Amino acid sequence: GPLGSHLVATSESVTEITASSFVVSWVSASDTVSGFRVEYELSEEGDEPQYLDLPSTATSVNIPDLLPGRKYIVNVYQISEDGEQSLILSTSQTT
């Protein structure tokens, strides 16, 4: 039982690459949410944003068809029963 040492990396749980994708997870900011909407766009090119919809029970999604070597801005919004969206998680990533 080595002390100060633990670096095992087991099996890198940060998988998503494939197609330069991203696997982003968040925490529901409300149980009244009717679903979730994920938005990802290039921070460089500034291309048009893409939107993905997930059920209120969804708390994680993989974004495929991403361009490797490009930086994306990802923002998660939860949809309320009234169709209202609220930013619960905002982060950027580099494929």
From Swiss-Prot:
Highest taxon, organism lineage: Eukaryota
Limits of the Fibronectin type-III domain: 8-95
Entry protein name: Ugl-Y2
Organism: Homo sapiens
Whole sequence portion shown: 721 to 809 of 2477
